[model samples]
Target: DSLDEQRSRYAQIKQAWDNRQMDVVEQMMPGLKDYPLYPYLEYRQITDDLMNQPAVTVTNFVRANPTLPPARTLQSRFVNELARREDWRGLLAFSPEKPGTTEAQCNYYYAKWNTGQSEEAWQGAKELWLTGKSQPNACDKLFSVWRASGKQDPLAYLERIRLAMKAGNTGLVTVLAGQMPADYQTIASAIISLANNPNTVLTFARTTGATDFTRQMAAVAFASVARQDAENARLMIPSLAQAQQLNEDQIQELRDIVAWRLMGNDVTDEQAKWRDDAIMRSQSTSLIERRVRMALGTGDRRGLNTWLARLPMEAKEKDEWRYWQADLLLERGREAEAKEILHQLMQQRGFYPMVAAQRIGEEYELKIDKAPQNVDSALTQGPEMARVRELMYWNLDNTARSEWANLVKSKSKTEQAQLARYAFNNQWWDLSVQATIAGKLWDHLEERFPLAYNDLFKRYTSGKEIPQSYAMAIARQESAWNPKVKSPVGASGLMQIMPGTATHTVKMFSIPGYSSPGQLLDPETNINIGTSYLQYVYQQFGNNRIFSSAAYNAGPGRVRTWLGNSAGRIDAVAFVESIPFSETRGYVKNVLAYDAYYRYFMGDKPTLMSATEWGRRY
Candidate 1:
């Protein structure tokens, strides 16, 4: 009865608000406090007058409900409104210690300056100006004020110019150049022009930009050239180094840049030679990962095996290369070493853990346990943790992430694991993924890989001959089961279903709804639409999971086009290896591996097979 009352009351207000029937909502206002969802009504009302509301009205409302999660969000909006009104003093008073957005922070800095916190504001502006990308428009005033205080110097100008060039912001390069001191403008302008035309990039490198004072700048310019034309960039390297009077110290990183580009070149018959050269030139450990990818994808067994053993860290800061090391040994008849690695991996609940178990012929080790009984009690112990729960309820994922990070940094190892468990129990999907990653508690199967939306999974796919595991795999990658997560390209919700695609699929199926794209954020509708699309793709490709999964990511046309030129039925792993987009290739590999694991979880058949068995039906 309580649940129904809350839903009934909330629905009345929400419908009124949605239809802009404010008078209808206000008519029932006296009864709002009777339900728990009353806060939403208050929030909706607060947002209506947010910009026009007097400071006391905003502050007093937030202060009254200090423990409520949206109160803090209300405070942030209040500050934003203060800034909009040029009310610096009020914004300063309400500014949270850590401002998440650029505009909020720049406004806070401007507020500080207005309130006589001049030294801090100037330092803050300088730090903010150091970013490579363009900042909020509010920053222009903050920067102007900082410069007026005489903090603008050639070194700062050069740094901004270099970062702008590195970021590929050529227009920012020109703007930054114009702001430079008279003497440095000529040199900065030359660098900008060189970047605009990379063949002319070396001319600057030959002059002042190539000097030891400008070695990093010169290296950056050359890297810019190599990005467009690695071979031409390579051909000119020796000559440019001589003509520019460059030494090993000046061009080492440039060589590293050239080396990386060379490895990615499909046109190169010289990959073997250049691979060695690039490694020697840059020697960035980051390159080893890229090198391993190329070597592993192309069947360069020796290279892959050798480098895995060579980098040889038992735990990469992110950890995965650790599993590869053992796989390399297994390939070389060192089953003893490989088995040891598999033992450690199998205990973890993840894609690699599942695959690692299969490689060693062991059953996946899954321990599913209910969350600790004191979950809510434990969460209440931390103010920030409760706030994370609140922010999630408000659908403010970005702010929740920032709040979680701030809270997480101070916790001990045990506390972090506790937070992970708490996040999972509360259905804080993003927080759970993050906390688990930090705590390395991957062995907690229930927390890391919960079977979300069971009835929906069965309803949409299992009953229709689509594998529940396959659909689950796509959801796992698409949004990591974070229902409100959105991709930059307008994909949204748990399945990251695109709005256009959802509308098309829904209309064809006659799901009977005409509304905003925001409706796709509804998990029920999203799951049904996403599963229907998956089924359509699989049927189109003759029930083969590989092309279906790839098409789900890279589009059906792309998969068809690539398969058309193929000799047909390439090794499934090889098929993924040939996928043109790195993002898409990675998407396919993760989805398949995740499907295999999801199958293992459900006691369904393992759908992934041997590397050589090839791509076809699941």
Candidate 2:
């Protein structure tokens, strides 16, 4: 009864809020006080009651709540209210109190920063930094504040170092080298000198108290110096040996560094000698492990196996030896044996289970069959069936539309659906969608078609601000409301899934029965996986349906890289027009077209626009 009452009241309040019924909302407040709506009610009441309250009461009220309601909404009403009155105290009160609140405060600060208010922007940065979080966005926020404050030198310097390190700016290392304080200079010089002189790293290590930094710096220095100073690095081995104060682990680390450097320099004789000495000095598991890796790189399989056999029988050494043995077997093309070893390694849940699984799948494909394995080899065999099976595997390797069309034309209805499910499980959305439609898997299609179209509509419409006509206009350009459709790139099913994408999706989602490549044809499974994948892409791309849809059509990583290179903001139509790939351009058109068709189906009379016009309006 309580659950039902809460649900009932929630629906009513949400409806009232959506409709902007202030009078009705006021009347509903008291009934919701002891309910779970207290936080929301308190927030709404503050804003609605603001005009009625005295200035003193308003001040006291803000002090009590600290931050307003709709905690995660990313709205800046409270910040705006405080800023409008020049109430810095109130503004500070609304600043984020927790780590997760950074995004909301960031939005608010960005508005103020864009408005040319340096003081407010500074306050925002200070608040964000106070939370003790260090995301890339936080660094970006701080840099923005520094930039707006008349490009002040001190803050700018700090921002530059932060940004340079964050962005992997190798050139900036030289520039910042001369500008930093002595302590910072030592750290910077240590990083830069790591490419040429490893001994400089020892200097930095003594000055800085972090062991991880010390180890990494030493590794980098060894890598950098080994090629140019192999003889010098070799001669330093005696000095390293004389360091009696060093622990056994530290001594071994130095020796491994010297041996790795020698290998890097192509000094095979010295490298082999040091490697043998390190193996002989294998009083501990750590030294033995390094020797195994060095042996693998030098093609010393005999030495590797010998050391593995004789090593101490500790748990860690046993695990390391298993991984090395698996690697050695893989290198020798003993794939079945390697697969067994990898399976055992995976069962042990050591460092490389996921890598082993991926490798096993790749090896199975490469070695077990001369052609690709079919998802439904369980069902049928004929000349045409054999051709289709071969084509499916070939298409799995490459997402060519001509190959897919050829396969689709030859396959029977059941074979086509099976092929589609195979593609779907592999994340071949384009191929899966095409195969399903070509096979006329309409029963499953009819059930999922409307829902898939509805998802696109929900994603594009923001806060009911955009008219339903806009959705209709875009849908007409994309899919034309034909859920069981295929694009030229072999995007199939209601949403037009792609073959390359389907393969990746299979691995990431760990879909069942993915032992073979052909299981993506089942329409029910295809739509379920396809829609879920679309949602994942949408989430990863920041809920920007335009970009998400674009990525869904193109690839998410490609879209992300393109966006990063663009000037901070992306224009929807311009982005569509600017797409270099013709298939992706047409894809944008088809999805927008389908969005329009769904709108028309929903009885919304809206003007159909080109990608250019839609871009202009938004």
Candidate 3:
């Protein structure tokens, strides 16, 4: 009876607040005093007339709630109001730390300066000034005050110029270069010239002094030139190194950059010799990994073994490296030693671990954790948990995510495991994924890989060539089952379907009306389009999951290029490792691992590689 009363009052207050019916809200809110979400109503009332409220009213509300999500909103809004009123001392009194937004931070620092904290304010302004991007207009006054104090000198300008160059803000670099002192003028000009033409590195190397600044500029140019004309850069290395008095480490860097470029191009006999020389001379772990891949691409098992042995202790410790080590050992008739390494690998979970299990004729061991007992009351009973639940109940997801993150951040690993189960039981799939991640519980496969949109996934994959598990794995890797997610590159929805891909897929398949990219936001539409595109890439790669996953990420043409570059019969694992793009390399591995986990959950036996994939020559 009491539960129904709270629900009824809560509903009335929510409706009244949304309708802006203040009288009804006032009448209904008193009845919700015992409700866990009562603070939300209080928050709305204060925020509705926030500007007119006295500082004490706002301060008291925020202080009472302290760590509550609504308290944060209240403080931020009141701080902005104080800034708007030009109450510098009041702003400082209320917000001692820097504000979250750039605009507010600018005002906050300026307030500090106005209130006689000149040194700290100047430090803040200088930190803000050092960025390559432009600061907010609100910062102009703070910068103006900082500059008048005679602290902005050539050294400061040069630091910002370096950042601008690194950020590819060439126009800003040029503007800052022109503003430097006479002593720095020539050095700055050389940097500008090299920015326009990397080949002009020779000019700078021949003419410039052997100063640290000049050497760094030349190093930047040399790196760029190595990418465009690696062979020419290789010839220029000795002269440039000698002119700049380059250290052995710096010279190795030059060689490493040139070798990296050469690895990406069409390999020739001379180029191969140069790459090998650079690899040995540099002894860089990154370069060695590439050499290993190169050996694999050329089917040189002897070279592969030699390079693998040369891997640094840390690199050799990685699962991929260990798996290969064991496989190679088995092939060499060292079954006892090989089995030990394979057993060590089977204790973990991942693509390589699954592969090792298959090699050793063992079922994958997921080591799934049993959900902790009595976690429900422990989770739902806490005040912090109540706030998080209330925020989520109101559909304030972003705020709830922040609140949830803060809640779990203070939890022990055991507590986080409990939270994971609670979140899963609550059907908060994304939070469940977050809990497993934050707790480092990689073996908690059920929580980490929630069966979200299960029916839709099964329906979409019904007649498709791609398995439901594979589609779920793709979606999991792409967006982590956050259907509303849009990547920075503008791929939308659970599958992260790019607008261009959606448009083309719709046209090619002649799907029904409203071919708008907006349709991609719908789960069913996204899955339909996503699954269709997955199957398309699958067929394009001759139904090989390795090539299909790579094509899905780095695109089909690049996968074709990698295959074309292989000398002969590349091993499947080597083909995945040899993918030039690091993101694509990791993407294929993750998608494969995720597919295996999903397959296991969906009552199917999982295999990392098929006989066809293992035996087929590239």
State in Å the error of residue 108, model 1: 2.7
**Please, what is the whole-model Cα lDDT of each candidate in the order they appear?**
0.70, 0.50, 0.81
Give me the displacement of residue 96 in model 3, in angstroms.
2.1
User: Best lDDT goes to which candidate?
Assistant: 3
Worst 10 residues of 2 by lDDT: 363-372
On residues 271-386, what C-alpha lDDT tens digit does candidate 3 reach at each position?
Answer: 87887888887768988888887777777789889889888899999898898888689989999999999998988888888878878888878778855876765655788787
Expressed as tens digits, the lDDT of each residue in 203-314 for candidate 2 is: 5455554554344444345444555566565665454334323457766665665554443323567567766686576565655554554444344567667666656777
Best by TM-score: 3
Task: Give the 10-residue window scoring lowest on summed lDDT in candidate 1.
Answer: 609-618
lDDT of 2: 0.50
lDDT of 3: 0.81
- State candidate 2's TM-score: 0.31
User: Over 4 Å off in model 3, which ranges?
Assistant: 1-61, 68-86, 101-103, 129-140, 152-156, 181-183, 382-399, 513-515
C-alpha root-mean-square deviation, each candidate: 4.9, 21.8, 3.5
User: For each candidate, how many residue pairs have backbone atoms clashing (under 3 Å)?
Assistant: 0, 51, 0
